[PDB]
Amino acid sequence: EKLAYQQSVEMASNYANQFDADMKANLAIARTISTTMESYETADRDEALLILENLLRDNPHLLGTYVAFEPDAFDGKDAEYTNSPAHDGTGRFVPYWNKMNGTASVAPLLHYDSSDYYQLPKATEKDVLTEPYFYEGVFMVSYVSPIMKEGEFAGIGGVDVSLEYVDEVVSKVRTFDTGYAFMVSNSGVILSHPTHKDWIGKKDLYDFGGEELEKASRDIKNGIGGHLETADPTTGKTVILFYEPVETGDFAFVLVVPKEEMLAGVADLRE
Numbered sequence: 142e143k144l145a146y147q148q149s150v151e152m153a154s155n156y157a158n159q160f161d162a163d164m165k166a167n168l169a170i171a172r173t174i175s176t177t178m179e180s181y182e183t184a185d186r187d188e189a190l191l192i193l194e195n196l197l198r199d200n201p202h203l204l205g206t207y208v209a210f211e212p213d214a215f216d217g218k219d220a221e222y223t224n225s226p227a228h229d230g231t232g233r234f235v236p237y238w239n240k241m242n243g244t245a246s247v248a249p250l251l252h253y254d255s256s257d258y259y260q261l262p263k264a265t266e267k268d269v270l271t272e273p274y275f276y277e278g279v280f281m282v283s284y285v286s287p288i289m290k291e292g293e294f295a296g297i298g299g300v301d302v303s304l305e306y307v308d309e310v311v312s313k314v315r316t317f318d319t320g321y322a323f324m325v326s327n328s329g330v331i332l333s334h335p336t337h338k339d340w341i342g343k344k345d346l347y348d349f350g351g352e353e354l355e356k357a358s359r360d361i362k363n364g365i366g367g368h369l370e371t372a373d374p375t376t377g378k379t380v381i382l383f384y385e386p387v388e389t390g391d392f393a394f395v396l397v398v399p400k401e402e403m404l405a406g407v408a409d410l411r412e
């Protein structure tokens with residue numbers, strides 16, 4: 142027993158759930174930014190900006206806040222704002238308020254005609270917690286929510302988090318003697334890691350090499366929690382991965398437990 146397994150699951154789950162609180166709340170902020178923009182008649186760009194700016198300022202964990210509208214969708218005055226502060230050649234209302242370099246500036250969004258953070262919500266007309274991407278230097282993840290104006294898609298409202306935040310938080314976690322933990326996106330990209338920050342956002346469970354690892358990639362794409370045995374990459378010692386879904390977005394929290402250390406666990410139960 143084997144109630145060893147039972148107990149790692151239970152913890153894996155606990156964590157996954159703590160990180161759900163965090164991610165549920167972020168999305169709530171986006172859903173609220175957008176339900177609001179749906180209800181916004183005035184359509185004063187500065188007032189918007191204020192809202193954005195102030196939600197960033199008041200939510201320190203947030204990489205940035207933003208709104209982005211379809212051509213003229215915001216206030217019909219797109220050709221007016223062309224090239225003014227916080228816009229681009231288009232004059233579309235696409236203001237991104239962000240801490241991207243300690244400094245809390247605002248700037249226009251980039252590639253909103255091609256990036257998930259916009260296109261997925263436009264295609265699905267539903268909320269999204271995007272896969273991690275490398276946007277203009279930083280690896281972040283966006284919680285975006287479509288602004289539906291009377292059954293018609295007017296654009297998005299969102300907020301960002303950096304992986305660098307995530308990893309800071311996750312690599313804290315320890316278990317047993319050598320055991321740790323990492324998050325992973327819904328397609329199994331690596332979101333955090335205690336000793337190889339070079340993997341973050343660059344490798345997904347398919348690169349970790351093995352074929353059982355491809356199995357668990359499917360469980361996590363479906364938000365199913367399970368476990369495997371596998372050799373650590375940097376050393377051949379068998380470890381057990383316990384992944385458990387993070388409900389919003391269906392990411393996965395993976396707990397790494399050294400196969401040994403569990404035999405050591407069970408031993409310490411003989412008297």
Ligand SMILES: [K+]
Pocket residue numbers: 251252253254255
């Ligand atoms: K582009």
